[PDB]
Design an enzyme around this catalytic site. Structure first.
Site, mmCIF file in Angstrom:
data_model
loop_
_atom_site.group_PDB
_atom_site.id
_atom_site.type_symbol
_atom_site.label_atom_id
_atom_site.label_comp_id
_atom_site.label_asym_id
_atom_site.label_seq_id
_atom_site.Cartn_x
_atom_site.Cartn_y
_atom_site.Cartn_z
ATOM 1 N N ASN A 247 -0.988 3.754 -6.785
ATOM 2 C CA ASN A 247 -0.264 4.945 -7.392
ATOM 3 C C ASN A 247 -1.253 5.255 -8.662
ATOM 4 O O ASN A 247 -1.870 4.456 -9.062
ATOM 5 C CB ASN A 247 1.008 4.645 -7.684
ATOM 6 C CG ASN A 247 2.168 3.999 -6.515
ATOM 7 O OD1 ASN A 247 2.776 3.239 -6.541
ATOM 8 N ND2 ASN A 247 1.951 5.209 -5.529
ATOM 9 N N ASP B 60 20.414 2.825 -5.816
ATOM 10 C CA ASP B 60 20.171 3.105 -7.385
ATOM 11 C C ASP B 60 20.610 4.257 -7.926
ATOM 12 O O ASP B 60 20.396 4.512 -8.970
ATOM 13 C CB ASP B 60 18.552 2.888 -7.369
ATOM 14 C CG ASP B 60 18.404 2.639 -9.094
ATOM 15 O OD1 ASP B 60 18.958 1.620 -9.556
ATOM 16 O OD2 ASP B 60 17.339 3.018 -9.628
ATOM 17 N N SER C 202 0.414 1.280 -10.416
ATOM 18 C CA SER C 202 1.529 0.399 -9.698
ATOM 19 C C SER C 202 0.890 0.598 -8.288
ATOM 20 O O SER C 202 0.082 1.188 -7.814
ATOM 21 C CB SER C 202 2.878 0.825 -9.694
ATOM 22 O OG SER C 202 3.322 2.194 -9.147
ATOM 23 N N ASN D 288 7.513 -0.091 -4.581
ATOM 24 C CA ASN D 288 6.625 -0.018 -5.456
ATOM 25 C C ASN D 288 6.891 -1.192 -6.398
ATOM 26 O O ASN D 288 7.913 -1.429 -6.888
ATOM 27 C CB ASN D 288 7.030 1.527 -6.103
ATOM 28 C CG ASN D 288 6.386 1.713 -7.238
ATOM 29 O OD1 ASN D 288 6.877 1.415 -8.514
ATOM 30 N ND2 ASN D 288 5.172 2.022 -7.101
ATOM 31 N N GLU E 70 5.680 6.784 5.360
ATOM 32 C CA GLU E 70 5.254 5.866 4.334
ATOM 33 C C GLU E 70 4.090 5.031 4.948
ATOM 34 O O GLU E 70 3.182 4.949 3.965
ATOM 35 C CB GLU E 70 6.407 4.873 3.780
ATOM 36 C CG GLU E 70 7.619 5.749 3.116
ATOM 37 C CD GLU E 70 7.090 6.441 1.751
ATOM 38 O OE1 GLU E 70 5.913 6.025 1.556
ATOM 39 O OE2 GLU E 70 7.717 7.131 1.158
ATOM 40 N N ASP F 177 -0.411 5.622 -11.738
ATOM 41 C CA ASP F 177 0.215 4.919 -12.836
ATOM 42 C C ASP F 177 -0.313 3.457 -12.727
ATOM 43 O O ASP F 177 -0.071 2.761 -13.795
ATOM 44 C CB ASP F 177 1.603 5.133 -12.927
ATOM 45 C CG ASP F 177 2.388 4.077 -11.987
ATOM 46 O OD1 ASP F 177 1.630 3.710 -10.942
ATOM 47 O OD2 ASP F 177 3.532 4.006 -12.113
ATOM 48 N N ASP G 131 2.307 0.369 -3.966
ATOM 49 C CA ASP G 131 3.377 0.500 -2.854
ATOM 50 C C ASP G 131 3.081 -0.619 -1.784
ATOM 51 O O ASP G 131 1.703 -0.355 -1.415
ATOM 52 C CB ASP G 131 3.437 1.923 -2.339
ATOM 53 C CG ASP G 131 3.903 2.998 -3.252
ATOM 54 O OD1 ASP G 131 4.668 2.652 -4.290
ATOM 55 O OD2 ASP G 131 3.823 4.029 -3.222
#
Length: 129
Positions: free
Chosen positions: A46, A101, A50, A59, A35, A48, A52
């Site tokens: 990202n 989650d 967003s 995110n 990562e 979209d 990270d």
């Protein structure tokens, strides 16, 4: 801060990631490697819109507030910049929530693609833990 491999493993262990939701330490170190290359300051935008943040590339769509991800949540209740600190506390606590989650570590696409099913224990080989 760029962590050493065993340096990061120790920090992650201290903060209770070792077998957290059943994932051995090497899973977390392997995830971190791919990562962020162990760099707390890593950021990545990202598609979209967003972003990270940090050692585990957490995110802003769901987990942290950066003030620029429309319609996003801040489920770890932190500014995203806390995820870039040399102290990994915020990153780890937030990761605990993410991995809880329902998809476990599959929440980290690089973990699924690069770590899952590999010899992740290699990531902690030689470390005094």
């Amino acid at each position: 801060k760029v962590f050493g491999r065993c340096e990061l493993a120790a920090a992650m262990k201290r903060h209770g990631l070792d077998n957290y939701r059943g994932y051995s330490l090497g899973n977390w170190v392997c995830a971190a490697k791919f990562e962020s290359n162990f760099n707390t300051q890593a950021t990545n935008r990202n598609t979209d819109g967003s972003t990270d943040y940090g050692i585990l590339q957490i995110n802003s769509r769901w987990w942290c507030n950066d003030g620029r991800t429309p319609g996003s949540r801040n489920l770890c209740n932190i500014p995203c910049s806390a995820l870039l600190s040399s102290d990994i506390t915020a990153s780890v606590n937030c990761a605990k929530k993410i991995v809880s989650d329902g998809n476990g570590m599959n929440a980290w696409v690089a973990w699924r693609n690069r770590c899952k099913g590999t010899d992740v224990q290699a990531w902690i080989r030689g470390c005094r833990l």
